[PDB]
Design an enzyme around this catalytic site. Structure first.
Site, PDB file in Angstrom:
ATOM      1  N   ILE B  67      42.973 -34.017  -6.177  1.00  0.00           N
ATOM      2  CA  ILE B  67      42.903 -34.284  -7.612  1.00  0.00           C
ATOM      3  C   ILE B  67      41.623 -33.730  -8.218  1.00  0.00           C
ATOM      4  O   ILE B  67      41.655 -33.018  -9.225  1.00  0.00           O
ATOM      5  CB  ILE B  67      43.040 -35.799  -7.873  1.00  0.00           C
ATOM      6  CG1 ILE B  67      44.254 -36.358  -7.129  1.00  0.00           C
ATOM      7  CG2 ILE B  67      43.151 -36.073  -9.364  1.00  0.00           C
ATOM      8  CD1 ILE B  67      44.062 -37.771  -6.628  1.00  0.00           C
ATOM      9  N   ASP B  68      40.480 -34.048  -7.618  1.00  0.00           N
ATOM     10  CA  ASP B  68      39.185 -33.622  -8.129  1.00  0.00           C
ATOM     11  C   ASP B  68      38.178 -33.689  -6.989  1.00  0.00           C
ATOM     12  O   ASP B  68      38.398 -34.404  -6.004  1.00  0.00           O
ATOM     13  CB  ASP B  68      38.735 -34.503  -9.305  1.00  0.00           C
ATOM     14  CG  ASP B  68      38.862 -35.986  -9.005  1.00  0.00           C
ATOM     15  OD1 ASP B  68      39.447 -36.336  -7.957  1.00  0.00           O
ATOM     16  OD2 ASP B  68      38.376 -36.801  -9.815  1.00  0.00           O
ATOM     17  N   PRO B  69      37.069 -32.956  -7.088  1.00  0.00           N
ATOM     18  CA  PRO B  69      36.037 -33.043  -6.051  1.00  0.00           C
ATOM     19  C   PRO B  69      35.366 -34.407  -6.043  1.00  0.00           C
ATOM     20  O   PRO B  69      35.496 -35.205  -6.974  1.00  0.00           O
ATOM     21  CB  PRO B  69      35.044 -31.939  -6.437  1.00  0.00           C
ATOM     22  CG  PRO B  69      35.809 -31.023  -7.332  1.00  0.00           C
ATOM     23  CD  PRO B  69      36.771 -31.901  -8.070  1.00  0.00           C
ATOM     24  N   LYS B 131      36.793 -36.597 -12.129  1.00  0.00           N
ATOM     25  CA  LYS B 131      37.581 -35.783 -13.055  1.00  0.00           C
ATOM     26  C   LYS B 131      37.187 -35.995 -14.513  1.00  0.00           C
ATOM     27  O   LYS B 131      38.049 -36.072 -15.394  1.00  0.00           O
ATOM     28  CB  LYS B 131      39.087 -36.031 -12.861  1.00  0.00           C
ATOM     29  CG  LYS B 131      39.584 -37.451 -13.103  1.00  0.00           C
ATOM     30  CD  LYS B 131      41.088 -37.546 -12.914  1.00  0.00           C
ATOM     31  CE  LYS B 131      41.828 -36.818 -14.023  1.00  0.00           C
ATOM     32  NZ  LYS B 131      43.304 -36.979 -13.906  1.00  0.00           N
TER      33      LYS B 131
END
Lengths: 1006, 218, 426
Positions: B67-69, B131
């Site tokens: 989804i996101d780092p 995010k």
């Protein structure tokens, strides 16, 4: 306390609650909280054997459970129906439960709350304070929603609050993006509970120079620096982007009853909240009535793209997730899903909605008075047009005469408007009022004070258009009726489909019938077939055609056939004609028409050749009684409508009958849907078979009947199609028609519920009286039982081209020999969206000429064919040689699958060929038109212009030089084939096409 | 493996030839919302935004997209933790151990698995805020996902609600595997033993299955 | 959801995808549905559409060998390959014929022996049988758990018609000329005709078959039959050399498509005679070929199976013969005999009058229903009184004409069965 319901909604927190919004007599809003419970139905043994005790147990008295599974039988030895009797109980559970052998699970829990408590969703009640738990000021809790709502009172009028908003952002070569393009104007129309209607437009003050702002302030525009300085009583207010966004945030957080927009969820609210987050980092926040939950502005997508047929698929609807009880209504989606239109745009809908006849009074150059008093039109349209005109500045005189309002005046039941219009020959013109037409990009290229004010007026007109449409469509009363009938929250009326809708009334009926229906076996996939869909007898009929319409044919077919899942004795199937004949004889001798009905349906499996369903149409089922109740309710509301004086009651009864009609006209499609509540394959097949049998009987009895010496001679004997009764068979019957009336009328058209029968007479009132007498005699002699027929209209010059494709002139029951213009086209090029305007106009003109050319009598097919050939030759040669200098020749239009992402069935590399060759192009996409050309030469081989210059995908340009010719398409042979279908010569004219030019060169290319 | 000098200060673009048809277009997107996301400090440094571009997409079989780092210690490589203390990587390692039978994972990197690429839907996020730069990568996220699905046979997503309507966002018809999140896809932990599904799907498409053992570091 | 994963995303789906040799009718027929369950039964994305009807067990065999060459040595298990109708069995699997999917179940004792054998070792893919002269003779049993000799001995223990075997573990290079074939034929005598001898390499999945041809181009006299009443015979073709030609059934005979009373030949063997297969371009239409076949075999006889029962023996004896009960000639005695046999009485109520009459007359359920469909009936009391035809264009095949001609016996059998049913279950 006396309250009236407004909306029902639920919170999405850990503790689920049901919120009721209500209005008092004085206008004070009340919020009530109820516990959210899960409802289950259990038997006596199941209830007595539950190890974990239920939270609350409620009895259901006695019931009777019946299994409605389908069994295929290869012989007459068929078992009986499964039935059981046991006392039932109802269980309330605060949390989700997994109970085995639990039935009646299809009904929603909100419907259970409505029905078990005996509460109408929108009823007006006089509550009790014995169970009042005051959560806070204006918010209470009721823990016993069965004695609090124990009394009901007649309806009383209540105030309501409305907000209609519109925005306008910065435009450029590309589409306006929230990242680079700032909001420029925001217009609002606000109505509170006091009836005060306020209009105001905010303009971004940082887009103009300081001296321009000072000039605007001098002109009478209020300049503000903070929200505290904002005044809602000034139409034009200048403010910064941050102040404007915070004003929008404050307005959108208010406890409105309705926030109505047009495509606002996808663009307006999305852009507003995105800009608010982007510039100030703030989020629009809604809160629950009891101040518990807090939610941000969420625009979520609901996708349902499936029709289970041959047509296309639906689109995705955007919705706003808020828990304040305010209904965020979008007119675009509601219009798309409830109305059929060629173009779904605000301008087109406004033009097609607001229209009235205005009489010309002055012709002083481009200064024309267009007085619209009540004398020039019917009652009501003048007031509507005046109200819409009070906040508008552009009028569409006639059909395409765009004019700008110079001065307006409002008088009693009329209006006075002056426009810059050229002198017209006639006196009365149909003025249609629509959206203003301006060049937004060019105006943005020269942004100043005047253009800012013009955009403000445009935005306020856009904002008020939503209110005008809302008032025109009667959305509020429709929502109230939908909530009352569907057993649904007022916000859920337009949010679901018929399968979700039908659960409420069926659940209400089941308790009255003391019956449960249980289905266990898994359902397979296999078609049903059926229907008649009569093809036209001839291909040309200029004679008057009377129309006979069945009164709710499918509900009456179901009520007469008793086609309920629990009434079907069984279905007998056969594969060989010997055993088929054995079964036919056994079914004829076993189940007789006096007591049963045997519907010869279509076999499911290919190996079967005989398929016979048997229905014992003596008991009353669930679907039959539901249909009978719905028909009776609609009839009662129809009889109450015209027997009333108040206009509010008129609107209420009209909405109620509309909802009852909708709910009654969905059962047939309900039974055919596998994922439904009344899926009965055999019952649906028997219904369509009986319908086609009735259509066959009515078509046969009138296919060639004659009236000689005042005696009605039916084409065939009055033979009862399937059952046996004590009825005469003599076709010749006595009539009250005059003796000298000598005519021969034959049935031609009819598919599922109506019959079109031509009569050789050309008179209008004479045909009307003849049709009335025919309808009376048919209702007395031809028909039987509930299958009654009403005379609808007379269709003069009803000419066919194919199945479901006919053009005619419609009359009325009171139509005289000088009837007003009224034409009806079904399936023809005039109504189809993929046909050019020129083609439609030519077809209409040719059919209007034919209406008298064929009525001449002595003009046989040869003379008509000669005249048509001469006219077509002249027109085609003139168009091919002389050519039309300007554009707008065909402009083929299409739905939203062409010229948005390439075209329908995209040609892949062809679009990319334009790319990398014209690097200044902008990302395309729209729903306007479609076209394909040929860049060839040698006019005999379709010599046209190149694609690149202007005959590419439909767009707009500034200037151009040389050109060769305009695109030519299949329309020529299309109209030739239509003429061939109309004319009786047919094949000969078919040759004439390839005799004319006979050129079919290559297409596409480059 | 070329590189571009955009009008801002990322340094690790280094895009492979497989990204060549779309990379320039990506540059256009980075010319629109660069400053809006660059105003706030991000969990990956600007010199780590486009690290996942040097990996060729030719001999790759499985795509794993997050989804996101991670909000902290962003390294530019998804599922890459030098300390092996993050919940996601630890849960993934535990799942691999339980489904395979290999113990004492001193090191475990997903960048050395043959056939599996570590991917993230959003290429960066603000420090501490997961995010945060969501709307600033939506076009880029869609472009990257469309480019990836046209080169791989299977897609193993992370998170349920985040990738709920992934069919709408994926107009290219590709067999997508609905994978959950290690910690909690919807406020609840899940195990999702489905690697054999990927193995048999690769076997169907006439290619070798993924050996979930080459990622261990000893 | 991943605890079972619908048995690991239905691992059996891949096996059925590669189950070309196990060409079960219903299995592959709804395998078209199997693949497209990714949106209905399974999850994610799954869609595909290919259907198959015939068998593809050829994957369990190597290339053909007929030219003279030196072949490699190895561990050989030598078994005799017979000729005739072939069926396969796999733990209750329906017996399906190659290329047609014909369902002819083996007897109950054979079923018990076969399922016991496959319970002893589950490595047996299928049981390749040979059905010649209505006799069930095993041919091969491909497996990996046990050697073919072990499978043959195990099935011998349970009781079954088992072929022979020879151990050629080590034989050096050797040249496989006709001398080795003669040695193999001498080791195990003819008895039930053998089309060839096949060797298996250490239980190899792919087997090898070697054979030659000795067809004689002399004459075809006529095709006789061996009707004796037990429905166990074949339409053996007789050559002018005073011998006989083995034939599977009338289906194989009509698939041969030869000409009677002509010089046409068949695929004769050195010690046997394999029936000819239609591979030429001679003018042999269905009409005259079926006409002469009927004229030779019998006026009433029709093309189905290998039985072609008579017409004048319908009466009440044929009903008892088909029901496997004691012979009788009186209605009440026949009813009592049916009542005495519990299994027969139970199976009577499970069958309709039309089906029972069709079985009693041995009619095929492929064209009799077609003839009945285009046939108007005047019937009374569930009995056929009058019958006539409507469409004669379907009477091109002489079989339907003969059936319509003998329809009187069908009406008699229908009336008898109706009377039996009305006297037994009322």
């Amino acid at each position: 306390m006396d309250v009236r319901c407004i909306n029902w909604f639920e919170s999405h927190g850990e503790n689920r609650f049901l919120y009721l919004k209500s209005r008092c007599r004085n206008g004070e809003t009340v919020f009530i909280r109820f516990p959210h419970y899960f409802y289950y139905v259990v038997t006596d043994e199941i209830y007595q054997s539950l190890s974990p005790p239920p939270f609350n147990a409620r009895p259901m008295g006695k019931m009777r459970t019946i299994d409605i599974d389908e069994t295929i039988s290869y012989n007459l030895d068929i078992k009986d129906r499964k039935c059981s009797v046991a006392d039932m109980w109802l269980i309330e559970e605060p949390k989700k439960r997994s109970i085995q052998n639990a039935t009646m699970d299809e009904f929603f829990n909100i419907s259970w709350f409505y029905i078990s408590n005996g509460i109408s969703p929108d009823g007006c009640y006089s509550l009790d304070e014995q169970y009042l738990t005051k959560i806070n000021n204006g918010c209470y809790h009721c823990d016993d929603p069965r004695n609090c709502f124990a009394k009901e009172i007649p309806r009383f009028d209540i105030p309501r609050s409305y907000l209609f908003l519109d925005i306008e952002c910065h435009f450029d070569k590309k589409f306006p993006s929230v990242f680079i393009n700032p909001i420029s104007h925001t217009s609002y129309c606000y109505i509170d509970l006091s009836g005060k209607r306020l209009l105001f437009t905010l303009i971004n003050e940082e887009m103009l120079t300081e001296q321009e702002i000072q000039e605007a302030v001098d002109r009478g525009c209020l300049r503000i620096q903070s929200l505290m300085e904002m005044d809602y009583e000034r139409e034009l207010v200048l403010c910064s982007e941050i102040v404007l966004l915070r004003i929008a945030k404050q307005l959108l957080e208010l406890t409105f009853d309705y926030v109505v927009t047009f495509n606002g969820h996808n663009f307006d609210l999305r852009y507003i909240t995105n800009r608010l987050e982007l510039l100030t980092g703030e989020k629009i926040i809604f809160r629950s009535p009891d101040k518990k939950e807090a939610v941000h502005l969420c625009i979520y997508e609901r996708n349902q793209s499936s029709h289970k047929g041959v047509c296309g698929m639906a689109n995705t609807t955007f919705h706003v997730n808020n828990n304040n009880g305010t209904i965020f209504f979008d007119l675009y989606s509601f219009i798309q899903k409830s109305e059929k239109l060629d173009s779904y745009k605000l301008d087109s809908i406004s033009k097609n909605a607001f229209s009235c006849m205005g009489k010309v009074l002055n012709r002083g150059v481009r200064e024309m008075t267009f007085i619209g008093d009540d004398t020039t039109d019917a009652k009501g349209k003048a007031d509507t047009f005046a109200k819409v005109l009070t906040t508008g500045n552009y009028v569409t005189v006639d059909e395409d005469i765009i004019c700008k309002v110079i001065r307006k005046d409002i008088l009693e039941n009329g209006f006075k408007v002056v426009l810059s219009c050229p002198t017209l020959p006639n006196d009365i013109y149909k003025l249609s009022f629509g959206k203003d037409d301006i060049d937004l990009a060019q105006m943005y290229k020269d942004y100043n004070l005047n253009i800012a004010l013009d955009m403000a007026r445009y935005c306020i007109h856009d904002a008020c258009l939503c209110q005008y449409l809302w008032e025109y469509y009667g959305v509020e009363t429709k929502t109230d009726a939908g909530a009352a009938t569907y057993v649904l929250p007022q916000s859920m009326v337009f949010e679901y489909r018929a399968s979700t809708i039908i659960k409420g009334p069926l659940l209400k009926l089941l308790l009255e019938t003391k019956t449960i229906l249980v289905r266990s076996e898994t359902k397979q996939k296999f078609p049903y077939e059926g229907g008649k869909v009569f093809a036209p007898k001839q291909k040309m009929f200029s004679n008057n055609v009377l129309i006979f319409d069945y009164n709710s044919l499918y509900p009456n077919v179901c009520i007469f056939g008793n086609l309920s899942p629990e009434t079907l004795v069984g279905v007998v199937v056969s594969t060989n004609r010997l055993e088929e004949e054995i079964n036919n004889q056994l079914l004829l001798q076993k189940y007789p028409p006096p007591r049963y009905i045997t519907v010869h349906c279509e076999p499911r499996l290919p190996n079967l050749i005989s398929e016979i369903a048997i229905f014992d149409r003596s008991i009353e089922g669930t679907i039959p009684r539901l249909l009978r109740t719905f028909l009776a309710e609609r009839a009662r509301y129809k009889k109450m409508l015209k027997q009333a004086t108040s206009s509010t009651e008129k609107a209420i009864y009209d909405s109620m009958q509309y909802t009852y009609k909708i709910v009654a006209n969905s059962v047939y499609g309900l039974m055919g849907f596998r994922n439904s509540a009344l899926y009965s394959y055999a019952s649906a097949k028997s219904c369509t078979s009986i319908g086609r049998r009735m259509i066959l009987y009515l078509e046969s009895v009138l296919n060639g009947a004659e009236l000689s010496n005042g005696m009605l001679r039916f084409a065939n004997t009055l033979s009862n199609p399937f059952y046996m009764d004590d009825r005469d068979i003599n076709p010749i019957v006595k009539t009250s028609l005059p003796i000298d009336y000598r005519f021969r009328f034959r049935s031609v058209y009819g598919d599922t519920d109506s019959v079109f029968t031509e009569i050789d007479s050309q008179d209008v009132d004479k045909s009307i009286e003849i049709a009335k007498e025919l309808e009376r005699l048919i209702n007395s002699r031809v028909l039987f039982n509930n299958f009654k027929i009403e005379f609808e209209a007379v269709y003069k010059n009803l000419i066919m081209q194919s199945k479901k494709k006919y053009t005619t002139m419609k009359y009325s029951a009171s139509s005289n020999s000088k009837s007003v213009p009224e034409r009806i086209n079904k399936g023809t090029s005039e109504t189809r969206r993929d046909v050019s305007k020129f083609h439609k106009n030519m077809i209409k003109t040719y059919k209007t000429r034919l209406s008298e050319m064929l009525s001449e009598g002595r003009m046989n097919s040869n003379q008509v064919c000669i005249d048509i050939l001469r006219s077509l030759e002249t027109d085609l040669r003139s168009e091919f040689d002389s050519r039309s200098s300007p554009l707008e020749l065909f402009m083929l239009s299409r739905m939203h699958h062409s010229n948005y992402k390439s075209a329908d069935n995209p040609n892949m590399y062809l679009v990319t060929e334009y790319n990398k060759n014209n690097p200044e192009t902008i990302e395309l996409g729209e729903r306007y038109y479609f076209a394909y050309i040929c860049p060839a030469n040698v006019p005999w081989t379709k010599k046209l212009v190149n694609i690149k210059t202007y005959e590419t995908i439909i767009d707009r340009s500034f200037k151009l030089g040389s050109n060769q010719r305009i695109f030519y398409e299949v329309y020529f042979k299309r109209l030739t084939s239509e003429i061939v279908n109309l004319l009786d010569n047919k094949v000969l004219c078919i040759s004439f096409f390839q005799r004319m030019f006979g050129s079919r060169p290559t297409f596409y290319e480059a | 493996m070329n590189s571009v000098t955009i009008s801002h200060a990322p340094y690790t673009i280094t895009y492979h030839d497989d990204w060549e048809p779309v990379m320039s277009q990506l540059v256009e997107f980075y010319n629109e919302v660069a400053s809006w996301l660059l105003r706030d400090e991000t969990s990956p440094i600007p010199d780590k935004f486009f690290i996942q571009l040097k990996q060729p997409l030719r001999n790759k079989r499985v795509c794993v997209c997050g989804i996101d780092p991670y909000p902290k210690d962003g390294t530019g490589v998804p599922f890459e933790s030098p300390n092996f203390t993050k919940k996601s990587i630890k849960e993934i390692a535990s799942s691999i151990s339980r489904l395979t039978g290999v113990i004492d994972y001193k090191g475990y990197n997903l960048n050395i698995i043959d056939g599996v690429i570590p991917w993230n839907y959003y290429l960066s996020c603000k420090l501490g805020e997961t995010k945060s730069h969501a709307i600033y990568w939506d076009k880029i996220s869609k472009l990257l996902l469309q480019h990836i699905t046209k080169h791989v046979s299977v897609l193993y997503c992370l998170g349920k609600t985040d990738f709920s309507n992934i069919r709408a966002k994926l107009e290219s018809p590709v067999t997508t595997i609905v994978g959950y999140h290690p910690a909690a896809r919807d406020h609840q932990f899940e195990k999702d033993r489905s690697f054999e599904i990927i193995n048999v799907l690769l076997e169907l498409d006439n290619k070798t299955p993924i050996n979930w053992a080459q990622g261990f570091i000893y | 959801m991943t605890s079972s994963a619908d048995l690991t995303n239905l691992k059996e789906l891949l096996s059925l995808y590669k189950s070309l040799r196990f060409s079960d009718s219903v299995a592959i027929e709804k395998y078209n549905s199997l693949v497209e369950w990714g949106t209905s039964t399974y999850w994610k994305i799954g869609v595909q559409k290919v259907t198959n009807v015939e068998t593809s067990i050829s994957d369990y065999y190597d290339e053909v060998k007929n030219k003279p060459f030196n072949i490699d040595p190895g561990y050989y298990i030598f078994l005799p390959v017979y000729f005739g109708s072939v069926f396969i069995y796999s733990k209750g699997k329906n017996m399906v014929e190659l290329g047609s999917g014909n369902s002819f179940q083996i007897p109950d004792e054979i079923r018990s022996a076969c399922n016991k054998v496959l319970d002893s070792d589950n490595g047996i893919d299928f049981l390749r049988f040979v059905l010649l002269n209505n006799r069930w003779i095993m041919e091969d049993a491909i497996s990996k758990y046990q050697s073919p000799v072990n499978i043959f001995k195990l099935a011998s223990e349970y009781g079954l018609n088992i072929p022979n075997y020879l151990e050629i573990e080590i034989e050096e290079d050797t040249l496989f000329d006709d001398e080795l074939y003669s040695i193999m034929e001498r080791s195990f005598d003819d008895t039930f005709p053998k089309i060839s001898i096949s060797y298996i390499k250490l239980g190899e999945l792919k087997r090898q078959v070697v054979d030659f041809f000795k067809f004689s181009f002399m004459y075809i006299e006529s095709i006789k039959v061996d009707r004796i009443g037990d429905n166990i015979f074949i339409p053996s073709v007789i050559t002018k050399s005073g011998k006989k030609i083995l034939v599977k059934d009338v289906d194989h005979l009509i698939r041969s498509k030869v000409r009677e009373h002509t010089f046409v030949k068949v695929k004769k063997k050195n010690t046997f005679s394999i029936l000819y297969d239609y591979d030429g371009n001679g003018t042999e239409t269905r009409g005259e070929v079926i006409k002469r076949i009927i004229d030779t075999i019998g006026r009433d006889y029709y093309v189905n199976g290998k039985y072609f029962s008579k017409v004048g023996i319908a009466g009440l004896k044929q009903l008892t013969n088909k029901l496997d009960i004691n012979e009788c000639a009186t209605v009440d005695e026949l009813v009592d005999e049916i009542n005495k046999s519990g299994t027969v009485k139970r199976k009577i109520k499970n069958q309709s009058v039309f089906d029972l009459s069709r079985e009693c007359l041995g009619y095929p359920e492929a064209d009799f229903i077609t003839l009945v469909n285009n046939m108007r009936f005047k019937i009374e009391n569930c009995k056929v009184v009058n019958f006539n035809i409507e469409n004669t264009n379907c009477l091109n095949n002489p079989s339907i004409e003969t059936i319509y001609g003998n329809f009187n016996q069908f009406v008699s059998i229908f009336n008898t069965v109706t009377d039996v049913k009305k006297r037994l279950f009322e």
